[PDB]
Amino acid sequence: PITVIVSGATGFIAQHVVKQLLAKNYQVIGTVRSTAKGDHLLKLFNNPKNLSYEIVEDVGTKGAFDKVLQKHGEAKVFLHLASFNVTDVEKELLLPAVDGTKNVLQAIYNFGNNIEKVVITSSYAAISTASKEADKNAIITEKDWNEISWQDALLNPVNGYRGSKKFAEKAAWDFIKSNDNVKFSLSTINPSFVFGPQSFGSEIKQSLNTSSEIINSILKLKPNDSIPASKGGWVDVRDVAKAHIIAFENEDAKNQRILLNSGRFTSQSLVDIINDKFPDLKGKIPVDEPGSDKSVIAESLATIDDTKSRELLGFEYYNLEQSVYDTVEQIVNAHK
């Protein structure tokens, strides 16, 4: 009857992890930022026996996770999933990511007596340097690191976001390699853009706060709008969630960085899928140049080589059409 702590349990990936964890009869302790968030989570799942929550209001502060670590000394696994308009990138993004990550691992170090496995959500952004991702001749693997400097990470909010992901993860590996006595292993889940439905249709707002907003933003275009430029790797949220669980159940995942990527997309890829699967919307959203995506992906993106990650996980991912469809279906039906 083994017990798992999940931080930020109402987040997008996290709810999916929780659902999958419950269905494997783990005892789950989620951390949430308020009683409202926690009561809400237990109601979505109809208050099962295996589910409970503790409150951690700011998950990056010193000692945020001590009281929950001390009260629940039977926890064997710590899944760290917890995370708007940026003035100073240095104080608002980079330091909180670096300091938050050190504080979390420090709490597990002092009081995580029985914690044997730790999984942290990172990002493809910590793997890929912009100049490499844009090189059709490049191969990118779990060993590649975003080589952006701290100085360059302050330039603009996009460099700030990807920089903070890289320095946050750099800080975690520094912690376990630089501290002695470390009793737990650490694994890392680095997804590209995360698509897919929410665990619950209840949760849909008008503007998704997730990466599925790329998909959502397509649905708000008029027939002669130009189609946004957006491209990258993507992976379905349910496969990311599942990877978090395989990451501590499989022993070979210890001290691994696991790349989570199903494939490549451009916005035209999404338009095409929607125009071909939703007769209702065909004619209300743009068409532009169908098929243009295959030449653009072929011509201007590195190849992501996640062979070792796929071997480590050993399960079939959703594909673009399923992931896009399941997402749009949820949004459309939720609006009634």
Question: DSSP letter at 282?
Answer: B
Is the distance from CB of 329 to CB of 200 less than 8 angstroms?
no
Strands 231-236 and 263-266: antiparallel
Is the distance from CB of 271 to CB of 320 less than 8 angstroms?
no
| Residue where the block lists tokens 């896009």 | 324
Count of residues for the chain? 336
The phi, psi pair for 93, rounded to 5°, reads -125, -50
Annotation: binding site = 10, 12-13, 33, 58-59, 81, 165, 194
Q: Report helix, strand or coil for 121.
A: strand
Q: Degrees (nearest 5) of the Cα angle 75, 76, 80?
A: 85
Question: DSSP letter at 179?
Answer: S
What is the DSSP secondary-structure string of 195-264?
A: ES--S-GGG--SS-SSTTHHHHHHHT--TTSPPPP-EEEEEEHHHHHHHHHHHHHSGGGTT-EEEE--EE
Tokens of residue 325, six digits: 């469809």
Strands 185-191 and 117-121: parallel
Q: Report helix, strand or coil for 284.
A: coil
Q: Please state, as a whole number, how many other Cβ atoms lie within 10 Å of the Cβ of residue 22.
A: 17
In angstroms, rounded to a whole number, what is the distance separating the alpha carbons of residues 139 and 302? 6
Q: Report helix, strand or coil for 316.
A: coil
Greatest extent of the chain over all pairs of C-alpha atoms, in Å: 62
Taking Cα atoms as reference points, which of 118, 79, 119, 82 lies closest to residue 97?
82
Tokens of residue 235, six digits: 């992976």
Resolution (A): 2.8
Is the distance from CB of 121 to CB of 244 less than 8 angstroms?
yes
Annotation: binding site for NADPH = 10, 12-13, 33, 58-59, 81, 165, 194
Catalytic hit among 37, 67, 143, 165: 165
Taking Cα atoms as reference points, which of 86, 37, 85, 81 lies closest to residue 59?
81
| Residue where the block lists tokens 């109809």 | 46
Whether 117 is catalytic: no
In angstroms, rounded to a whole number, what is the distance separating the alpha carbons of residues 321 and 208? 19
Q: How was this structure determined?
A: X-ray
